[PDB]
């Protein structure tokens, strides 16, 4: 019941509001892949 | 008579390092006793997340 005030970056648009992260700070220097990396494979 | 009307010598400047924007790269240390050691290292101990 209780906040707490961090920054972030906020894009505007179609009168809706959404936060942008790059999780890149958090995969760093670490054995597993960052699942937003994704392969595709087209015929 | 030949008229000799001046003579010039070099008025050469001086350049220094620190004077130099690449001492910004580098971080310059005198040490007077570097001429006996034959060896310098650094140690990094990193763990990883």
Redesign the interface.
């Known amino acids: 019941h209780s906040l707490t005030p961090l920054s972030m970056d906020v894009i505007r648009l179609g009168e809706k509001t959404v936060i942008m992260e790059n999780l890149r700070r958090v995969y ?4 597993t892949k960052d699942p937003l990396e994704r392969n595709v494979d087209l015929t | 008579f030949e008229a000799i009307f001046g003579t010039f010598c070099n008025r050469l400047e001086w350049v220094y390092f620190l004077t130099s924007g690449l001492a910004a790269a580098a971080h310059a240390i005198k040490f007077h006793d570097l001429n006996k050691l034959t060896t310098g290292k650094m140690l990094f101990h990193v763990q990883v997340p």
């Not at chain 1, 760093?28 to 054995?31: E, P």
């Open positions: 760093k220097n670490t054995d």
